Design a protein around this ligand. Structure first.
Ligand SMILES: Cc1cn([C@H]2C[C@H](O)[C@@H](COP(=O)(O)OP(=O)(O)O[C@H]3O[C@@H](C)[C@H](O)[C@@H](O)[C@H]3O)O2)c(=O)[nH]c1=O
Ligand SMILES: Cc1cn([C@H]2C[C@H](O)[C@@H](COP(=O)(O)OP(=O)(O)O[C@H]3O[C@@H](C)[C@H](O)[C@@H](O)[C@H]3O)O2)c(=O)[nH]c1=O
Ligand SMILES: Cc1cn([C@H]2C[C@H](O)[C@@H](COP(=O)(O)OP(=O)(O)O[C@H]3O[C@@H](C)[C@H](O)[C@@H](O)[C@H]3O)O2)c(=O)[nH]c1=O
Ligand SMILES: Cc1cn([C@H]2C[C@H](O)[C@@H](COP(=O)(O)OP(=O)(O)O[C@H]3O[C@@H](C)[C@H](O)[C@@H](O)[C@H]3O)O2)c(=O)[nH]c1=O
Lengths: 295, 295, 293, 293
């Protein structure tokens, strides 16, 4: 009976991308054909998480709620909470403490895109763990802006350093973390860092010192994209666009995932699609009931 | 003393791009490094128009106002009005009738990008006309979704047909129109078309029958981009991005145009830039005071 | 020891004029020539003996590019196809090359990318009999061989460019065969469109109940480059991944080194004359960059 | 009758391996080979006599592509550059070709696009003495000749790749010259970097007070393609414009027809063997598509 509680952290001071983020939050902006936040929401749904808390800024949380609602249209439970100030990833587990309660949980960042073959099998393995924590390591060209994993010769994780001056490897900790029921108390016990933030690296290092942290390599066959620059936002959009145009399939379509997980039935999906029948996205939903696709 | 009144029509039912436009209006979405509406706002400013009325939907007009304010930060006058229902381009001159008053005017669409050499000279020539109307004709591959100009052998405009089944040419009327003080009364006199809209083509055909319509060809050396599909939105963004990265210059930067037109002075521009000093856009503003550029 | 064939011949004039005097598979996909990608796919499958088939005009160009493969601890040979008379003709041109060994054919303009691709190719390479092809959901299946699947995705038929495709699953341009294929290819007759059809070869294995049709899931990119637009899209796709990762897709030097077909001294030697460009710097950094494999 | 030179020789190995066996200026920019663009720029200037300079290895490839130009009512000849020893060497290799006429040099990998470009090139082509070059604001001027401008944008100096560039204006890769240039190029000596410098030729005209330095404004695209990324960016830029307009950039057949260098019967004849691809269909539609010129 594993009902993991998912958190999407979708706040952030939001100034690197000025002026496109001046009055619209980054995680509501389009990545090709759908808002950014559809992708990490979909990642949680593909992991099996059906209870999702969306955290954003005081000003933008009504905007996320106007877009996703309570999630019942997708047979899910989506709730909202605000982060007054962007004081660190680990504050998600203080703001989301009541939502998490006594259950296992997962945190994903609202601007992180995960894509690749067998991603579901890897997320389901992380979701099924009853103890400890699971994070993922991914080779990037700029590891120094992330938590960086030091690996021994067999890729067992030895340490995690947040934004090291000399990174021990190129493997960054991705923005997706699975935890057991210790994390809320761990997050409440840690102190702000020199840069003034409650550090997810400190949470992860606590599990590491207990020898209960699983650090899974996300291989180069996966795309783990964040979108920190105007250029990389375009690059994520064209990357998504090339795949969808080639396949005739949509990445991170929550209606599709909900239907495939039996969270909604064929009548409900048709009901979502009928008012969207005049656009391409509604046509894809309509065609899910006829097009044989391996899932 | 030519103080032309500019209107940006930035409403629209907004469903072709679902779901990216579900809770954010299309004209607030990014085209590379800045919101879409910066481009037609800039076009008006490059034409010399300093008084701008922004029309959008009831729901999104506060959003445009939160982003542009009253324009005094750029030494301009920007006002707002709502379109309850998207009943046609020519309704802009009913909603904006009081704003226009007894002055000449210009209408530009909130999702139209205009770019090219000597665009300013062409817009200033259209702006300086004391009588009649000036519209622009542009060769597109899909003229049939636009007002289409029929030309004689010397490219004198003979007729304009809105969305013809068999287009007489490939020249579409762009989404930028200059009018004398007849347009508000002309717009109030016309009747909705079979498709239920107050047609700008009917306004333009009225000037045409008076022999006071100037139809100027916008040559293929210009980019006139609207962004009707997910694909063409990306294509406009990468197009802008290639030029700006090559030149080290920004397209449709309103601060720059305001400074160059002496609507704001060096102290004011520095003041806009100082709180933006941590991002690339603020660095470009800061560098306008030192970088010698022909304008 | 499976023998690989890369079919890199005449693609027609659809892309005119970019292919007017340069064969398509010599043209860049972002940062390296197109044929590097299917070459790398064969190497990832473990195939070390490769026959490159091209037009007579461009065989010295492919040979000038890849050499005999000994620089990567491989064996690369060349053969010509005077006229592009069908995929299955590769097994006539390469009959001597294949001999009595198993083989694989890949198209010189097909890109394959995704997680665990190696595990799937090694499983196909390790089969002792029959054939393996892969099925991939595309929006325009009718320009390919199309797989008809039952409810359990068992393959029932393969039709070359059907008017009404029975599914959206196209047969990708990568095929593994046992020692029957050369004799089969020699036995089939030109089709209505005048070509020796890989679909007829594959349909033979299916009717013999020795064809494995494996789904290549949507987590994979299977890209060909049949239009000017899709050539661009393949280039920007690769570019997004390499810029993000700091890693290069389809770097044959890297693959040979990781498979121990060449050692560090040989890799440094390949790198030194390239030290002034980014590609040679990437090879040099392979000796220090810890990458999981 | 001004004589045009396209310098399309050796660019080094920065783009390795995409240029390893194919010269860069034969490679595609979206839908046509790179050299089509500077070729078209010369034709838009009115230049009808073109010398293509390339490496010895690729001169048959350029010639296989463009022919003698008589198919477009032009005169196209070929010459080789054994070693890439400087832009100004084009006027030594092409000394016989230029003779006593005026000339223009354009780089085989430079793209020029924008409104009224023709009016500007025709004004340069119509000058009776001196030289004309163009200055363009770029983010990395230090990799070019850089123009020093006074407050009125009168040119004061040109420095080749200065450490501290005096402005952001680079000299673009398109130059118009009177009959002095060949003798000047024969007179200059290799520079510190070992090249015969176009900046030394241009600085000679400036000191003689016969150099016109014209700003090419930001409304123009002046694109070279020195990196893998910028080659992609040039391709997607062209693609965005052609898809929007239904028009093709740098179509030599179109330019020759509009300038009446070939007539409709000759254009139909060029089109007929290409009727099965989009390029030949575009030529055919030129006879019906009313386009302002
Ligand atoms: C700090 C913070 C960020 N955010 C948002 C803003 C961004 O969209 C996103 C990440 O912001 P950043 O400043 O980059 O956080 P960050 O600097 O903490 O980066 C993190 O990145 C992870 C991927 C690594 O695994 C971590 O180890 C860590 O490096 O989260 C919040 O909403 N609230 C916050 O408190
Ligand atoms: C009709 C309408 C549109 N809009 C917005 C929505 C879009 O962003 C933009 C244009 O919407 P459309 O449905 O395409 O309008 P449209 O169908 O009227 O197209 C017009 O296009 C011009 C370029 C041509 O010159 C005209 O002749 C005409 O063809 O204006 C409004 O805000 N209010 C309205 O009343
Ligand atoms: C026919 C042929 C093609 N080719 C080249 C041209 C192209 O680069 C590439 C493919 O050419 P086409 O005309 O598309 O081949 P094709 O039309 O035979 O396509 C094939 O595609 C496969 C992916 C499917 O599995 C097959 O079932 C089949 O549909 O191979 C040759 O070199 N020689 C030939 O004999
Ligand atoms: C030097 C040289 C280059 N080339 C080719 C290689 C490239 O495609 C192209 C340019 O080569 P480069 O090394 O960049 O040349 P370059 O370094 O001389 O660059 C020149 O660029 C012009 C735009 C400026 O106006 C000049 O002032 C100068 O900066 O010409 C030759 O064919 N022959 C040669 O002799």
């Amino acid at each position: 009976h594993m009902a993991r509680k998912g958190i999407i952290l979708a706040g952030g001071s939001g100034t690197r991308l000025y002026p496109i983020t001046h009055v619209v939050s980054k995680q509501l902006l389009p990545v090709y054909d759908k808002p950014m936040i559809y992708y990490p929401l979909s990642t949680l749904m593909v992991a099996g998480i059906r209870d999702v808390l969306i955290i954003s800024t005081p000003q933008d949380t009504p905007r996320f709620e106007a877009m996703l609602g309570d999630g019942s249209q997708w047979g899910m439970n989506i709730q909202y909470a605000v982060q007054p100030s962007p004081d660190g990833l680990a504050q998600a587990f203080i703001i989301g403490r009541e939502f998490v309660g006594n259950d296992p949980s997962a945190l994903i960042l609202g601007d992180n895109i995960f894509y690749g073959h067998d991603l579901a099998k890897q997320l389901e393995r992380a979701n099924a763990r009853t103890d400890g924590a699971t994070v993922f390591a991914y080779h990037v060209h700029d590891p120094e802006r992330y938590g960086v994993v030091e690996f021994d010769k067999d890729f067992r994780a030895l340490s995690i350093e947040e934004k090291p001056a000399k990174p021990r490897s190129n493997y960054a900790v991705t923005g997706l973390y699975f935890y057991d029921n210790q994390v809320c108390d761990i997050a409440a016990d840690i102190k702000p860092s020199a840069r003034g933030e409650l550090e997810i690296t400190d949470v992860n290092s606590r599990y590491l010192s207990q020898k209960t942290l699983d650090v899974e390599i996300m291989g180069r066959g996966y795309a783990w994209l964040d979108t920190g620059t105007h250029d990389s936002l375009i690059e994520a959009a064209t990357f998504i666009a090339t795949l969808q145009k080639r396949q005739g399939l949509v990445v991170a379509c929550p209606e599709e995932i909900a239907y495939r997980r039996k969270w909604i039935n064929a009548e409900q999906l048709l009901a979502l699609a009928r008012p969207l029948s005049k656009n391409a996205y509604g046509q894809y939903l309509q065609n899910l009931l006829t097009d044989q696709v391996a899932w």
